Design a protein around this ligand. Structure first.
Ligand SMILES: O=[N+]([O-])c1cccc(O)c1
Ligand SMILES: [Zn+2]
Lengths: 28, 21
């Protein structure tokens, strides 16, 4: 739970950088 | 899921791009 939440924060930042202007979607 | 494939195993920049719009 806590481990999954901490990873999600970094995943969400990484997606923001890779996708750029196209944007992205995050659903846990 | 994003979590299923990248919180258990490491993900390349190409793998994450599949989750872009
Ligand atoms: O473990 N990963 O797959 C992961 C998490 C956060 C950022 C990233 O580039 C890769
Ligand atoms: Zn952290």
């Amino acid at each position: 739970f806590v481990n999954q939440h901490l990873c999600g924060s970094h995943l969400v930042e990484a997606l923001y950088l890779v996708c750029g202007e196209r944007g992205f979607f995050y659903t846990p | 899921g994003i979590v299923e494939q990248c919180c258990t195993s490491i993900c390349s920049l190409y793998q994450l791009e599949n989750y872009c719009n």
